[PDB]
Design a protein around this ligand. Structure first.
Ligand code: 5VL
Ligand code: OGA
Ligand code: NI
Ligand code: ZN
Length: 331
């Protein structure tokens, strides 16, 4: 078995290898990359996402989110307080202000220490889930707005045509902005390109050990667990690497820098934080290997999760027994 320790693997495709997206995902899996839950892909030196990022300041962040924490330094939840709209130029200025800017630090490890020590005492503002793309339309390789759709994958594999669409989202981050422990909707893959700015640190649990993380989360967030059998779908819970280690949860960590792709694999729990002002683009995707994960994916039906239009068909076709209860949750 390849990659039996479930290490995060890093890939350096050639420009020739970078032509066929599906083929390269399959290649990574042949080397055991999926066992980690997360892989890094460094594009060939000849590749670029777009010419420059000099003209992005007028993009609107319609609903910036202030991420307010509750709990203790290593075990906390966050809720999102809506703020007034601002442009990316305004957001960048805010990120760089004395109140929100990255503190002096020695290296990534020092900054990680500061993050887990001090995150809960601040409330950074995140411009997340903005529909759009920063890939040039002429970028033919690994263009996240030109991937095969999940709906077409399901049709190719299972023979049924379904409604729905599948487009990328932009994320503008600042120091301490946080993504909570989660797997993707319907335990899909995700791919994330860091377009510009400061790094993003990721934590990930191997898919074969996801239930260990779920069990710990139930113990650490007991009220939340009683409220919903799949409350990590709410994407509000954080657990530090120290607490994971104390509880014997297998995980890995890696820092993504500008110009690098990350892929998360089906049922790979992940969480992390941004180092400073940055912009990432991400989208979900599927492969034939995903179908069995989609069939088995947990669902939130308590009403909190509330997801895309397109998830309806996934649940309807892959999980018909769960569909009625889930759909009630979506109203
Ligand atoms: O300076 C900016 C102003 C506005 C939007 C983006 C940038 C930027 C783009 C790439 C790299 C760094 C940057 O700060
Ligand atoms: O970048 C973020 O804030 C969160 N991204 C993801 O969870 C992802 O790409 O799957
Ligand atoms: Ni994700
Ligand atoms: Zn729920």
């Amino acid at each position: 078995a390849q990659n039996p320790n479930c290490n995060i693997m890093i890939f350096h495709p050639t420009k020739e290898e970078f032509n066929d997206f599906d083929k390269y995902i399959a290649y990574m899996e042949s080397q055991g990359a999926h066992r980690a839950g997360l892989a890094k892909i460094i594009p060939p030196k000849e590749w670029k996402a777009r010419e420059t990022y000099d003209n992005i300041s007028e993009i609107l962040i319609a609903t910036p989110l202030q991420q307010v924490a509750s709990g203790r330094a290593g075990v906390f939840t966050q809720y999102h307080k809506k703020k007034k709209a601002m442009t990316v130029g305004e957001y960048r200025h805010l990120a760089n202000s004395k109140k929100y800017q990255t503190p002096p630090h020695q290296n990534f490890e020092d900054l990680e220490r500061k993050y887990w020590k001090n995150r809960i005492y601040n409330s950074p503002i995140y411009g997340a889930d903005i529909s759009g793309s920063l890939f040039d339309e002429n970028t033919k390789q690994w263009n996240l707005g030109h991937l095969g759709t999940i709906q077409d994958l399901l049709e190719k594999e299972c023979g049924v045509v379904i409604e729905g669409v599948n487009t990328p989202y932009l994320y503008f981050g600042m120091w301490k902005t946080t993504f909570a422990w989660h797997t993707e909707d319907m335990d899909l893959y995700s791919i994330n390109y860091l377009h510009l700015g400061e790094p993003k640190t990721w934590y990930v649990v191997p898919p074969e050990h996801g239930q260990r993380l779920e069990r710990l989360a139930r113990e650490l967030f007991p009220g939340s667990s009683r409220g919903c059998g799949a409350f990590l779908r709410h994407k509000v819970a954080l657990i530090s690497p120290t607490v994971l280690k104390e509880n014997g949860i297998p995980f890995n960590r890696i820092t993504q820098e500008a110009g690098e792709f990350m892929v998360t694999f089906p049922y790979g729990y992940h969480a992390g934080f941004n180092h400073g002002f940055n912009c990432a683009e991400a989208i979900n995707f599927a492969t034939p290997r995903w179908i069995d994960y989609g069939k088995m994916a947990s669902q939130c039906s308590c009403g909190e999760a509330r997801v895309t239009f397109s998830m309806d068909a996934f649940v309807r076709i892959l999980q018909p027994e769960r569909y009625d209860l889930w759909k009630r949750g979506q109203d």
